[PDB]
């Protein structure tokens, strides 16, 4: 869906179709939060279904469903 793609693009700064810990931290800091590196990695790991260390759109969709 288009709504989820807009939400994904908020995080996917370089538009390579994946969200990294740095991209996640960037958004969270822009919203007044200050997560640690370990915290960021935990957040990604939880929904990183294929274990490759980043979140792609299909993994994103699964999370948001």
């Amino acid at each position: 869906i288009a709504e989820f793609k807009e939400a994904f693009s908020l995080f996917d700064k370089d538009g390579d179709g994946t969200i990294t810990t740095k991209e996640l931290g960037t958004v969270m800091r822009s919203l007044g939060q200050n997560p640690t590196e370990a915290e960021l990695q935990d957040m990604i790991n939880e929904v990183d279904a294929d274990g490759n260390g980043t979140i792609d759109f299909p993994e994103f969709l699964t999370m948001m469903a």
Binding site: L10, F11, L24, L31, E39, D42, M43, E46, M63, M64
Partner: protein, 244 residues
């Protein structure tokens, strides 16, 4: 176990973006509605409160159409729901699509569906009117308005009209369109040398003062990475309306 923390960060960012969109559309649509309601001696202060009982919506439709609509005089929630439905039925008869917009949602002041209702009204009464020399066959109204905008700014150095969002943020397009219409109104040398906010403020001011076009947009909401498309289209359409 799982703690949903990425989900919550996405929710925060996404809700932030959607709330900002709602905020900007609310301003645009309130000003647009009031441009018409004044002709019926009515005025909206809060778009999410002042349409709930159906009376201002019915009046808005009467002004836009020149028609007489029925109107419930009862004061209970039952009558407000009926009253709102009168407006919806008027639109539905005219084949206006109102997906998921119910009399309950308007009576409850739902932001998304109240904004959505005004947008469909703007689309039907104002934006859908446009015809443009050079238009293709099954072009949408939006596509025709984009073509019109593109034609108006041909010949202006370094200006591009690719969309109804980012192309408009720096205010140059708004100024060029006014200048094309009445060049004495706009100093394009100033336009090229000015900041985005200066250009936006000036275009909106000249269009209101000299072309009778209501200022629907605040420069600070347009000079952003992603201007609101519905808001831009509404205002650009209004520029078109003032240029016979």
């Amino acid at each position: 176990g799982p703690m949903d923390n990425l989900y919550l960060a996405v929710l925060r960012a996404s809700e932030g973006k959607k709330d900002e969109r709602d905020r900007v559309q609310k301003k645009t649509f309130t000003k647009w509605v009031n441009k018409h309601l004044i002709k019926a001696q009515r005025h909206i202060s809060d778009l999410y409160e002042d349409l709930r009982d159906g009376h201002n919506l019915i009046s808005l439709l009467e002004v836009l159409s020149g028609d007489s609509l029925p109107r419930e005089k009862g004061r209970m929630r039952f009558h407000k729901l009926q009253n709102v439905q009168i407006a919806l039925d008027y639109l539905r008869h005219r084949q206006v699509k109102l997906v998921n917009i119910r009399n309950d949602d308007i009576a409850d002041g739902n932001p998304k569906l109240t904004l959505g209702l005004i947008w469909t009204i703007i689309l039907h009464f104002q934006i859908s009117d446009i015809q443009v020399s050079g238009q293709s066959e099954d072009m949408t109204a939006k596509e025709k308005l984009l073509l019109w905008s593109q034609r108006m700014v041909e010949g202006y150095q370094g200006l591009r009209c690719d969309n109804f969002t980012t192309s408009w943020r720096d205010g140059r397009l708004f100024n060029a369109i006014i200048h094309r219409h009445k060049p004495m109104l706009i100093d394009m040398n100033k336009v090229y040398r000015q900041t985005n906010l200066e250009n936006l403020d000036q275009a909106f001011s000249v269009a209101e003062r000299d072309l009778g076009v209501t200022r629907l947009l605040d420069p600070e909401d347009v000079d952003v990475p992603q201007p609101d498309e519905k808001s831009i289209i509404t205002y650009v359409s209004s520029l078109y309306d003032a240029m016979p």
